[model samples]
Target: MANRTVKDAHSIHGTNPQYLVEKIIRTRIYESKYWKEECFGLTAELVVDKAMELRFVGGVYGGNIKPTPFLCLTLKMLQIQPEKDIIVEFIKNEDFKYVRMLGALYMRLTGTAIDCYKYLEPLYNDYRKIKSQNRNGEFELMHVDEFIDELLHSERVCDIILPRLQKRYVLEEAEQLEP
Candidate 1:
């Protein structure tokens, strides 16, 4: 067997049942178990959507790329729903906050190989802390403002390494058709 070379590394998961449960829940959501399609006139959570796409990233990277552990873990957590309070608490946990901090670190070093890292942490954490604990994640759950803010910013992570996306998008295009 050929020895595989590792390209990148990031923080590992910490004690947080909410994070674990969130991982299970979001997986089902993106894989189309909950609120599968846009209802009436609503969009499925983009963080959840991006989480699913990371699988494609791994498949495409194969042996060439190593995704930041923080990125992969957060994506897994996003697979769960925003309504679950326990899960919401997990997102705000300090360990998870470390995940986002590390992801941004990845972006500064590698430049946005992970799409939702910029927005997911702040939006998720703030929502859990301010809005959800007070009453609900309903507003924060759908909060696309940070996502919009990050995506719309002049210095988006996407623009940093778009050239690499030629291969990445090709895999993504193929995925869009399967289901």
Candidate 2:
């Protein structure tokens, strides 16, 4: 066989509608405060359209920091924790499942890159449990029993545990400051 290039199965960009929808959802969550700086740089500029407003957009009128419609959507989905239940607890309403799946894929790929999901796996299992019960007749965003079970059974491992981690790293300096 000739040489073949392998690509990630989690890519959100493509002609596939599922992928596109997933891309949109993942993009929103990725831009949220918890994950944005971790994924992108602290001062990185976000891409935006002309009409979007962020939570801080009221004072940003006519300023350089224009928010995009995508950022508006992102802030809406920012209530959940990355390690616990970002997609299911935060954005899994009836109108938004496609975005959730793409987000799961994004977490899987990016989490793999950063090696932080030793704590993220149990929540994903909970997400799978919630997803397995999905049905067409459902009027709400989630199944009642599954949702309740997820709330009760899912341990808040990351929330309770993250603060205990060592945050300060050692920095070495030279004898003189460089001029």
RMSD of 1: 16.9
Steric clash pairs (candidate 1): 25-79, 25-80, 26-79, 26-80, 27-79
Write one digit per residue (lDDT tens) for candidate 2, span 49-150: 111221111101122332233332333222211232443332243334334333333333223222223333333434332222112222234333343333
Off by over 4 Å in 1: 1-63, 78-96, 99-179
TM-score of 2: 0.20
Q: Which residue pairs come into collision in candidate 2?
A: none
Query: Candidate 2, residue 122: CA error in Å?
Result: 4.3
| TM-score, per-candidate, Cα-based | 0.22, 0.20
Q: How does candidate 1 fare on TM-score?
A: 0.22
Q: What shift in Å separates residue 163 of candidate 1 from its native position after superposition?
A: 19
Candidate RMSDs in Å, in order, are: 16.9, 16.8
* Alpha-carbon lDDT, every model: 0.29, 0.28
